[PDB]
Each structure stands twice: as structure tokens, then as C-alpha cells.
């Protein structure tokens, strides 16, 4: 049967990943605001603010990587080394993001 253009599939996935990254960045920005408004009186202010700030920096970085992953063409064999490195890095940063959000939850739900 006639195949998918796998670059278009991979771009559409990278786009959905950028959309979920935006929705998470917007949740963690709301969390940051809700923590900073309580300030130094909160029991976990320092670690929670640090965790949320790390998570936002990582999310903005992953969004930039996803811009570059949509820029390059997965059909272009000269770009394979970049698209592969950038996608490995984006997946590793999304892993660190999910771990940090696990800790943001473990504090916030108290």
C-alpha cells in the first residue's frame, strides 16, 4: 500500500509534543505563580520554586528543540545525525521534566 510520508508524521508528532509541552508549561507557570504568591512562609518554598523553575527552563528548552526538530527534514540523510541527537536530547529532557513534575506533585499535594 502507498506509504505515509514519515517526515510529515514525525512533524505532526513533534507538534503534538509541543502542544502538550505548552499545556504543561502553562500548568507549571500557574503553579509558580501560586507558590510565589504564598512566599517564604510556605513550608517548601525554596525546593518547590526551584523545582518549578527547573521544569519551566527544561520545557522552554524542549520547545526550542522541537522547533528545530520540525525545521529539519527526516528524509534528509545529511540531517539524520542532528535529528537523532536532537530527538534523543528532547526525550531525555522530557524524562527529567516528568521526574521533576513527580517531585513538584509530591510537594504540592501536601
Amino acid at each position: 500500500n502507498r506509504p505515509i510520508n514519515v517526515n510529515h508524521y514525525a512533524n505532526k508528532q513533534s507538534a503534538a509534543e509541543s502542544m502538550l509541552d505548552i499545556a504543561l508549561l502553562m500548568a507549571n507557570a500557574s503553579q509558580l505563580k501560586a507558590v510565589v504568591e504564598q512566599g517564604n512562609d510556605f513550608a517548601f518554598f525554596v525546593p518547590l520554586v526551584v523545582l518549578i523553575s527547573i521544569s519551566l527552563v527544561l520545557q522552554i528548552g524542549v520547545g526550542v528543540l522541537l522547533i528545530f526538530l520540525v525545521k529539519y527534514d527526516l528524509n534528509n540523510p545529511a540531517k539524520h545525525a542532528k535529528l537523532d541527537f536532537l530527538n534523543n536530547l528532547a526525550t531525555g529532557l522530557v524524562f527529567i521534566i516528568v521526574v521533576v513534575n513527580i517531585f513538584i506533585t509530591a510537594f504540592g499535594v501536601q
Binding site: 502507498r2 506509504p3 505515509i4 510520508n5 514519515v6 527534514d73 528524509n75 534528509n76 540523510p77 545529511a78 540531517k79 539524520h80
Partner: protein, 118 residues
């Protein structure tokens, strides 16, 4: 059976030129297929080196820095054929060259390859 038919090896003086060709058959191909053809070279006392690769529908190409600008790979999509043009052949280019085909995660390699002596 998937088969690669390879031709164009030979003996040439340094600085000369050669043109390898690789006709691939036995599998369906479409535009937007995730398909590559390429050329890999092997020589005594050295590692296996990827020389050139092309996406034969989109025309994107990759070259090793050892041949980049000297070599040129091209595709002949309705004949499902690829060509590698070699120019300014150095003595260091003396190797056996194997056509590579890659179709959707399946790797195919030349039944014999062909010898280039500079």
C-alpha cells in the same frame, strides 16, 4: 528476492573519474517512501566507511568528508537506479565499493560489490 546489480568498477589513474551504478529490484517503491540508496567502501587495514547516500525521490544526499565535493550520488527513480560519480580519485580511494539499499528498516547489500583501484 531483493537484488542489487552493481557495475562500473575498474582501474584508473589518480585524479581520474569513475561512475558506479546500482539497479535495485524486487521491492515496491513509492515517492514519500522511506528509501535510501548508498555506497559503502572497505579496504585492508581500515574501517568500513559510508561513502554516499541519497534519498532518491527527494534528492537529499549525504557524503563523507573524505569524498564530499569530490563525489556525487544521483538517482534514476523510474529505473530505480542510483549512480555514484567519482572525480579527482585519490590513491586513498582505492577500495571495494558496495551498493547499499535501505527500505523501511530493512538493510540490503551488494551480492559482490565492485573493486576500484586507483
Amino acid at each position: 528476492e531483493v537484488q542489487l546489480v552493481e557495475s562500473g568498477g575498474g582501474l584508473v589513474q589518480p585524479g581520474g573519474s569513475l561512475r558506479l551504478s546500482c539497479a535495485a529490484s524486487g521491492f515496491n517503491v513509492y515517492s514519500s517512501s522511506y528509501y535510501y540508496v548508498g555506497w559503502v567502501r572497505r579496504a585492508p587495514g581500515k574501517g568500513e566507511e559510508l561513502v554516499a547516500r541519497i534519498s532518491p525521490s527527494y534528492g537529499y544526499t549525504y557524503y563523507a568528508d573524505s569524498v564530499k565535493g569530490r563525489f556525487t550520488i544521483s538517482a534514476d527513480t523510474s529505473k530505480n537506479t542510483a549512480y555514484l560519480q567519482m572525480n579527482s580519485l585519490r590513491a586513498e580511494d582505492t577500495a571495494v565499493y558496495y551498493c547499499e539499499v535501505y527500505i523501511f528498516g530493512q538493510y540490503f547489500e551488494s551480492g559482490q560489490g565492485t573493486l576500484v583501484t586507483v
